Ligand binder design. Structure first.
Ligand SMILES: [Cl-]
Ligand SMILES: [Cl-]
Ligand SMILES: [Cl-]
Ligand SMILES: [Cl-]
Lengths: 258, 258, 258, 258
């Protein structure tokens, strides 16, 4: 029972880590608020939550919009009257392009969602988190640990997010609110597998070849799973981490070390 | 039950974090091996373990000595037949001296205990950890995050340990063995309180003054507790962290961020 | 003669570091392109350059505008026919506000100037830098080394810039173009002195008090001067640094170490 | 004239970087003290120095021995009466072995030379450096930026050295003494070429294959040269770097970024 009787808000619930996270939080005793633009996706996630016997509030939210984040906060406080944890899940799909071929509009949009969206959420729920002495976990990315070609827009936005997360730990720490980051690389599950299958066919190779190439830089020679990344997020969200704020915990089977 | 039916070896069991850690591992379902030079100290820790209903093997061990580490391994394998976790606890008491006034003998001894001792332990238990696909947690220190005057010998040894821990994650990762570090600053409990009381009298001030000065750089304006640092170590030792190796997790209430 | 017969473009020429930099580059044998929004400021800087016997091209440029950066490139290539160095000087004045009181518009504008402006410049001059196997120096900030309250918008933009600079080293390195950053804290000179004088009067203290407080975290107990920061930038721009790319060189008298 | 009328002590003068460094310092106007165990090697380096018209004092010194470092200091002060720069050059040849196969004696010896030797030198020359407000440059290594298998003993010693260098910047900064590090990877020149030739024959491949493999991780797809690493050291030793202390400057053509 890591999260018994806590309310956890997850923004950016997709079919992969987001769904695993919602399920895992519920298994650990949390009730959920699920936020995403497309509310049809939240329906099955909510079922996995309610199957554990917990509650799920699903709220269609564009976190780039002030009114919509205000509505999410209002609906949450109406349904539960409290928030213990806010998780900003990394939903936006990165495009591998060198900066030379990346549009400025794309990078502005990436910052809008990844940085300002997360800030809007955190700020919206600051009053709730002040009362609960709660925790924020921002899902970041291994991309901040390297400078590989074509990862620039993604590294830029994620780096701005990491920097913001760090300042927020300082600024919200006097209210007793913890703010940490979890930095996964590739995350193995059904979604990444389908993607590797597409890549395998498109490049005339095997999924094993693609998987092994992706995992080769790691110490363990395996990619972390959705559950393994979720476990790190749950730890940071929980009272096991009550002494921990301002930190980035990398979940990457050792590929980059910090 | 984070550590149900696991065997955990703790080296460097003292009255503070070490004792809390042993107790907490046992509460989470682990049986213990307790190693320290002074075996009289292990007696009360073993009682806290056996009070939870688990088992404790106490073995007097100078981890700077090959024969004594070999004996610890032999006694552990005779008693339990397996090891899932090795924790190298930071026992050695640092002396605040500028390098100019630090003896070379002191620094050699610090490296001997903090670095080579930990390596000797890890190597001794590598065969056991290979079979269990186990985990190593090395307790390091916040000192590696700054360069403050008089912390040099301590930062040097701890930095060498961190570097070694990182290489060990690479080298032992192919055997499926995880290696991580936990980096606490000051750790609040009975031991640190007595120390602050001594300092308070010796400098004509209050414990509150000393505590608040120590905590002022943190985001949360509190020092982490023995339990909070223990929780981080338990997480890293557990299967919740099965996707995590080569990492340093700082438990410092935000004073330094990484 | 560090920069003999090289052409150096400086964007963001202000009264402080920018003016010192232009003068110093010219003293080292460079001809200059000076770019800023307000062209009246470029007049006196150009005189300091031409007093050394070198040439200065002054071009009013809003580096947030595609057409204006295109014009700067065209005018430079018309006047000099080459570019060896591009320096993106940190001009924008940060406002100390917690994130909670910072407008999203302000942060978008900070990113626009500090990040996208610098990228636009670098991209505009990529063809020139390819031919010269030239160098880019982005002036960043000590703020990326800490998470102090009220520095958030500034740290966010500067961090995004640092991340971008690092990826650009990878992406432009195959064309033989070097990209490095110089990270100053406070920079002592006439401009910062006037500012400390304002602060001194407004807080009822001395300039010495303010200066000493600002310098207290440093190892040397002094702030770096405009010349000292300029020297670091000149080194990185020069062939002395031909083995160096992707690096951040902090000029802060030891306050933060990397 | 970066070092006009300065006295530069170089410890660990070998046939590669050390010889290039001595020559380059002399070309920039410095007089030299050359220290190494084997004094026969110092003879040709001293000739390259005196060919520039400067002076070279050659002193056979085991920097692991107190009396011998005391003698080096005494001979230097007798010959020149001052020291402006101390450079601890990385001489010791690393053995690629996993920790499991590395003897403790080897690692103690590596620390003795790389860490304690450098400290002994710095301390011996502290009185001289106090008077000159001088500078220390410790030649470190790219190995501190990664955790690759078999580099453990080398990373451990170099990491301890980096940590020590950082504390020394704090501790000696109040005397106005600067302390920085230069972190090269492979360094191209006659010595490394012979080594690649040996490897080429022993593995049945070309020097080009070996060179290109070594350079593949870099941004520039070339290894830094002895001159390029020397240039970085000269910069850090010089008054161009008078605002810079406590810093590590990586000279690696972009392979690792900090
Ligand atoms: Cl998702
Ligand atoms: Cl203890
Ligand atoms: Cl300026
Ligand atoms: Cl050498």
């Amino acid at each position: 029972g890591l999260l018994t009787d806590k309310v956890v808000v997850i923004s950016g619930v997709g079919p992969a880590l987001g769904t695993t996270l919602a399920r895992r939080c519920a298994e650990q005793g949390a009730d959920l608020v699920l936020a995403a633009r497309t509310v049809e996706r939240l329906e099955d996630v909510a079922k996995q939550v309610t199957d554990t016997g917990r509650r799920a509030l699903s709220v269609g939210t564009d976190i780039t919009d002030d009114a919509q984040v205000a509505h999410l906060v209002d609906e949450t406080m109406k349904a539960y009257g409290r928030v213990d944890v806010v998780i900003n899940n990394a939903f936006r799909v990165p495009s591998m392009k060198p900066f030379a071929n990346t549009t400025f509009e794309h990078m502005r949009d990436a910052i809008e969602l990844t940085v300002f969206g997360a800030l809007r959420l955190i700020q919206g729920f600051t009053p709730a988190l002040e009362e609960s002495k709660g925790a924020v976990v921002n899902v970041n990315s291994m991309v901040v640990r390297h400078s590989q070609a074509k990862y620039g827009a993604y590294k830029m936005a994620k780096s701005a997010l990491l920097a913001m997360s760090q300042t927020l730990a300082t600024e919200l720490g006097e209210k007793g609110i913890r703010v940490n980051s979890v930095l996964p690389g590739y995350i193995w599950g059904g979604t990444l597998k389908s993607y590797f299958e597409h890549q395998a066919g498109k490049y005339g190779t095997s999924v094993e070849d693609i998987y092994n190439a992706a995992a080769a830089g790691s110490d363990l020679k395996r990619l972390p799973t959705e559950d393994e990344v979720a476990s790190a997020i749950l730890f940071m969200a929980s009272d096991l981490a009550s002494g921990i704020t301002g930190q980035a915990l990398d979940v990457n089977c050792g590929e980059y070390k910090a």
